[PDB]
Design a protein around this ligand. Structure first.
Ligand SMILES: O=C(NCCc1cocn1)c1ccccc1
Ligand SMILES: [Zn+2]
Length: 140
């Protein structure tokens, strides 16, 4: 589990969104595994605006943050899970690292701010849904 809290937005994995998220919906995209809902309180996270390929992510199944090198956001075929059939997921970045299903939502960050959240994994890989292209998270 986990979310990004930037401005009056909450960014979560679409497959983990609650009824309150869907009832306060700003934007959602199944192909990216992302959903954004509105918040009453202002958040403290800031979004990175960059092309970094090195950063640190939080792994809840280890209670640890790990430094990683990750690929650029791409269209990747992801195997079936409890939440999606096997399909192409867009804007996805891969790294070598531990992940389990409940690690979704952990933040990946670089020197510039939040880069994305854990969305996929297995066999020593972790995949992150990028948010750096969503410029509108910084305003309104
Ligand atoms: O179940 C997982 N992800 C659920 C969401 C998903 C995105 O594409 C397909 N399902 C998962 C599995 C192992 C490690 C980390 C994450
Ligand atoms: Zn960066």
């Amino acid at each position: 589990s986990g979310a990004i809290y930037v401005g009056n937005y909450r960014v979560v994995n679409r497959h983990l969104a609650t009824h309150n998220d869907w009832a306060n919906l700003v934007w959602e995209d199944s192909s990216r595994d992302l959903l954004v809902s509105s918040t009453t309180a202002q958040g403290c996270d800031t979004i990175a605006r960059c092309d970094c390929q090195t950063g640190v992510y939080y792994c809840s199944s280890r209670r640890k943050h790990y430094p990683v090198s990750f690929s650029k956001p791409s269209l990747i075929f992801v195997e079936a899970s409890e939440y999606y059939p096997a399909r192409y997921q867009s804007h996805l970045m891969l790294a070598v690292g531990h992940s389990e299903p409940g690690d979704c939502g952990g933040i990946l960050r670089c020197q510039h701010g939040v880069v994305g959240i854990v969305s996929t994994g297995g066999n020593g890989l972790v995949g992150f849904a990028d948010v750096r292209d969503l410029l509108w998270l910084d305003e309104e």
